[PDB]
């Protein structure tokens, strides 16, 4: 194993738990707004590929 | 997107455009910016998708224990 | 209807779509839709600076064009 | 009778957006812009050339070291004030459709400024008279002072220019380094580019 | 132009019309315009429509009950 | 028929960078972000919208895409998810008697 590892882990899982909102929430809007744009990959790529 | 982006295109165009161009070209810009800031949270270290893998303790994931029964017949 | 609006699957369909409407067009003498189409169509520059010159009605640049793309 | 309307439809639509764009018409709301519906012809209501005074923009024509004294630089000139050039909303986009914007819209406009460019027929002479009433209008209303008779030749002429060139540009240019139309297409581009077509009235609908 | 068919049609008519049209020259498309009689469908009765009940289909059609009148 | 090579080229080098990009990461991390289906969500379906023309523009109209229920899969699951290989525990029935089980259908 190693002990140091995990302590960087925990702390590392400690220290996301602590950003604040705002943050956070723009992480949240970052990943919706992927899946989004992931939904529709296929008729923007045949677009493009006309295009 | 990014190995030939439209926004080049666009200006030299020879043919008449349409709104569904621009239309294109401003979505792969939206593509092209939130990878950017996707990328930049990551490198930051303050992606909640990526994180360090944990330990597994090899005792536990092979034998049943008395309380796990139990906690089975609970349930 | 089947010229436009196809998948990128559809490549060869559509292009003997565009083929056969072109046909048409010359047929009918309506060369200005029949321009517009190979000039939408078309991919070398060559070939879309020299028909919209024979469409102006200039021919001595047009011939020239298709002098340097030959 | 859908595509023999669809073709009367574009080409009527090129000849209104060249004659709009000439006189730098603005405010082209889609309530004054009547379309038959047995032909394609089309024809827009309330035909005035928008002017704004030269301090109001940032025209240079007045700095081609016109005999005007430079007390007086507030003399009219024709200008669009409206972002896009001439209208062109994706509707009629939708409508023309993909291949009729190359083969109709930009070759008639091609065609219609070709023509009407100093081939035996030069508006140097003819646009003279209707700007000098232009101008005396604008003075009268406005500004609401008499223009002297120099001032008033020079003013004539500098606008008389102006018009004349906006005509030219769009001539293809003698060489064939490109595709003719390319002004157009020029034109064609900035009118159809969203940047553009957002930053406008509401009262001008470009949605429609 | 109606005028203008192939030998099942009549002869004579049909040869001086072209006779008439060729003598003319120049002047015989110099009214050649852009159409202006097109009908709509509003005109040309048509648009008139009637709820019908078809064997193979499960519910009601709405047919066109106008294409004879 | 250049173009061709040229765009599988175009996609030999996407694949190749992807696969150095996950050997990168991977290796003492768990990464998510190429992972497509990973963090699955249960996107709403909204009948507001008609016109349907570039999903992903039209912020305020995609903005009536509400996401609901938001979860994560075991890798395998996932991996499951690509390709057409049907999902671990799936029962079809058919005509009283089983049948072989059958993918997911694919919506757009």
Redesign the interface.
């Given at each position: 194993f190693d002990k140091r590892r995990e302590t960087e882990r925990k702390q590392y899982l400690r220290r996301l738990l602590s950003r604040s909102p705002t943050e956070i929430a723009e992480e949240e809007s970052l990943v919706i707004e992927a899946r989004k744009f992931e939904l529709a990959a296929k008729k923007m790529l045949t677009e493009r590929a006309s295009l | 997107t990014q190995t030939f982006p439209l926004a080049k295109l666009l200006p030299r165009s020879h043919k008449s455009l349409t709104t569904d161009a621009y239309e294109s070209a401003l979505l792969e810009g939206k593509i092209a910016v939130l990878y950017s800031r996707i990328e930049e949270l990551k490198r930051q270290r303050k992606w909640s998708l990526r994180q360090p893998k944990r330990f597994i303790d090899p005792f536990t994931r092979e034998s049943p224990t008395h309380w796990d029964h139990l906690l089975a017949e609970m349930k | 209807e089947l010229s436009e609006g196809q998948g990128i699957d559809n490549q060869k369909i559509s292009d003997a779509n565009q083929d056969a409407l072109l046909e048409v067009y010359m047929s009918l003498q309506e060369d200005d839709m029949f321009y517009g189409t190979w000039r939408r169509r078309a991919k070398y520059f060559e070939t879309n600076a020299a028909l919209s010159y024979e469409q102006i009605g200039i021919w001595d640049k047009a011939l020239q064009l298709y002098e340097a793309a030959q | 009778?859908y595509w023999?309307?669809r073709?009367?439809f574009t080409?009527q639509y090129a000849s209104f957006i060249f004659m709009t764009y000439i006189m730098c018409i603005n405010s082209r709301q889609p309530q004054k812009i009547h379309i038959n519906?047995?032909?394609?012809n089309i024809w827009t209501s309330e035909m005035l050339p928008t002017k704004v005074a030269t301090g109001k923009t940032h025209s240079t024509a007045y700095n081609n070291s016109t005999l005007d004294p430079a007390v007086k630089a507030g003399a009219p000139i024709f200008y669009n004030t409206e972002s896009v050039p001439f209208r062109l909303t994706?509707n009629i986009?939708k409508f023309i459709?993909?291949?009729?914007?190359?083969?109709?819209?930009?070759?008639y406009i091609?065609?219609i400024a070709?023509s009407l460019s100093d081939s035996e027929f030069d508006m140097e002479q003819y646009l003279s008279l209707f700007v000098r009433d232009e101008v005396i209008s604008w003075f009268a209303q406005q500004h609401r002072a008499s223009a002297q008779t120099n001032q008033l030749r020079e003013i004539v002429r500098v606008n008389v220019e102006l018009l004349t060139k906006r005509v030219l540009q769009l001539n293809?240019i003698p060489n064939?380094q490109?595709?003719?139309?390319?002004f157009v297409?020029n034109l064609?581009?900035q009118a159809?580019?969203?940047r553009n077509?957002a930053y406008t009235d509401s009262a001008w609908m470009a949605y429609l | 132009s109606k005028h203008l068919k192939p030998l099942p049609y009549y002869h004579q008519h049909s040869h001086t019309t072209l006779r008439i049209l060729g003598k003319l020259g120049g002047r015989n498309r110099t009214f050649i315009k852009p159409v202006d009689n097109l009908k709509t469908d509003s005109e040309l009765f048509q648009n008139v429509e009637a709820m019908f009940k078809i064997h193979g289909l499960p519910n009601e059609v709405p047919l066109s009950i106008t294409p004879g009148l | 028929s250049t173009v061709l090579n040229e765009k599988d080229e175009a996609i030999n080098r996407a694949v190749a960078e992807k696969l150095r990009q996950r050997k990168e990461s991977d290796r003492g991390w768990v990464n998510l972000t190429d992972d497509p289906f990973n963090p699955f969500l249960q996107f709403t379906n909204p009948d507001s919208i008609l016109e349907k023309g570039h999903f992903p523009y039209s912020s305020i109209a995609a903005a009536l895409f509400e996401v609901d229920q938001s979860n994560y899969f075991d890798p395998e699951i996932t991996q499951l998810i690509k390709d057409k290989k049907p999902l671990p525990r799936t029962l079809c029935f058919k005509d009283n008697a089983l049948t072989t089980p059958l993918p997911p259908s694919i919506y757009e």
């Open positions: - | - | - | 009778n023999l309307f073709k009367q080409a519906e047995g032909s394609g994706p986009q459709g993909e291949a009729g914007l190359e083969g109709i819209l930009s070759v091609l065609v070709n293809h064939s490109n595709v003719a139309t390319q297409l064609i581009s159809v580019n969203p077509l | - | -």
